Amino acid sequence: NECLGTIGPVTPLDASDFALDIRMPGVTPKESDTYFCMSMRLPVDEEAFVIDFKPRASMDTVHHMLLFGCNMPSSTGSYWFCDEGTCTDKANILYAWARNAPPTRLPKGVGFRVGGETGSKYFVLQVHYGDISAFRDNHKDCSGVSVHLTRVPQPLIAGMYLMMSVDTVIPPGEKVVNADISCQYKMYPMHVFAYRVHTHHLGKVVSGYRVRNGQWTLIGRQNPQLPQAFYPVEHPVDVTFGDILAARCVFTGEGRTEATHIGGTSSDEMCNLYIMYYMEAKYALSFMTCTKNVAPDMFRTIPAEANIPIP
Ligand SMILES: [Cu+2]
Ligand SMILES: [Cu+2]
Ligand code: NI
Numbered sequence: 577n578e579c580l581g582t583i584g585p586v587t588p589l590d591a592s593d594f595a596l597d598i599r600m601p602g603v604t605p606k607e608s609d610t611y612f613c614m615s616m617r618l619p620v621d622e623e624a625f626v627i628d629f630k631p632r633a634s635m636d637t638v639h640h641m642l643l644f645g646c647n648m649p650s651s652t653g654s655y656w657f658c659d660e661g662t663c664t665d666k667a668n669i670l671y672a673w674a675r676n677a678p679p680t681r682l683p684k685g686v687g688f689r690v691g692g693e694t695g696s697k698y699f700v701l702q703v704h705y706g707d708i709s710a711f712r713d714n715h716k717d718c719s720g721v722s723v724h725l726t727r728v729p730q731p732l733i734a735g736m737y738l739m740m741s742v743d744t745v746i747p748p749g750e751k752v753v754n755a756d757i758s759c760q761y762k763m764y765p766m767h768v769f770a771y772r773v774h775t776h777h778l779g780k781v782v783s784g785y786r787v788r789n790g791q792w793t794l795i796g797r798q799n800p801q802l803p804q805a806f807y808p809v810e811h812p813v814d815v816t817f818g819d820i821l822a823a824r825c826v827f828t829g830e831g832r833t834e835a836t837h838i839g840g841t842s843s844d845e846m847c848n849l850y851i852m853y854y855m856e857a858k859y860a861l862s863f864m865t866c867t868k869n870v871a872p873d874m875f876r877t878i879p880a881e882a883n884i885p886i887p
Contacts, residue, residue, distance in 0.1 A: 611703075615700050668736060670688050678805075685731045733856075755847040
């Protein structure tokens, strides 16, 4: 999309509402597969609610976009290489845009709580650029995300339950290496409404479930080699005190000359499942994480689909 110039990144929509435009500061990439990061401080200090996102991406040029909330961006820079890092504190993902898979909108009444004494103070925008051909004219790029904000407290609060591995090791050439993650859910009821999967080049399939009374209810299952958007949850799923959250990533070792562990770089791996949920405002909590496998044996009775790659 076009660069902002004189009009500025902030448009008031109403007394309470306003739109914030988060855009690359006229960047020109020089190599393939480049990853650019930038930040915007929230213009208000008081608690606000992120209630809608617009993609402003030049269709020919961008592979994916990601927006985070965090309090300490990795750079004071105008922009920077995301390989350097997104946030020093916890980067809370709010939005994912992908090319061949258009995002679905937040349910009405559901909003991310930001700012205030406790919420995110900064947005961080990650723009993955793919084919650099369109930059034959050396032109500046200003792609990114417009964001709808409000002071009106939402009845439902969006959050993230991040499941990720930490201890996986993928022996070179090993047919199948399973990364299991499991945690017992201890908060008020959450309703999952979307998921994103993330591995690096070695993941084959990723599946997350809710287990209750020993029975596996599918949250999401995706090929991580496909565009890694937030996908809608087919039938919405309540997770309740007592339930166990379980995810498995299937990896291969074939193609690799050396062992592969969890890490930041492309020659390392990751097994992340992002469960986007919403809760009743008065109960709600913005982020939860599982980096353990508390019920390893329970995986014996995992459904078989969690082990076969999608059609
Ligand atoms: Cu991408
Ligand atoms: Cu990664
Ligand atoms: Ni329900």
